[PDB]
């Protein structure tokens, strides 16, 4: 909003931008604790291990 | 925090109540008996009060 506001004042700012990387995708992944439980597998392994 | 032969699941709200709480209870302010907290500043060594 604020660089909108900006840009909207031509005559005043000149490129104003923002210093900084915008969002990106990213790789989530869910671990389930009742699965790993169940299955015998410890949480702190399988995050050790990936 | 557990599984049981039954199936049934053992959470922490379960065993325990779960509450956003003072890290430690020692200390309790009150300012003209109304519920309040604050800062006690000391200065530091060779520093200018004002």
């Known amino acids: 909003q604020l660089l909108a506001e900006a840009a909207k004042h031509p005559d005043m700012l000149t490129s104003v931008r923002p210093n900084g990387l915008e969002d990106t995708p990213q790789f989530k992944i869910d671990i389930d604790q009742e699965k790993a439980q169940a299955l015998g597998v410890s949480i702190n392994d399988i995050n050790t291990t990936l | ?50």
Do not use: H, M, W
């Not at chain 2, 557990?2 to 709480?21: C, F, M, P, T, Y």
């Not at chain 2, 209870?25 to 530091?44: T, W």
């Open chain 2, 1 to 50: 925090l557990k599984v049981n032969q039954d199936g049934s699941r053992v959470l922490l709200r379960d065993v325990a109540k779960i509450e956003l709480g003072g890290e430690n209870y020692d200390i309790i302010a009150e300012f003209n008996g109304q519920p309040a907290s604050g800062l006690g500043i000391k200065l530091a060594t060779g520093a200018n009060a004002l």
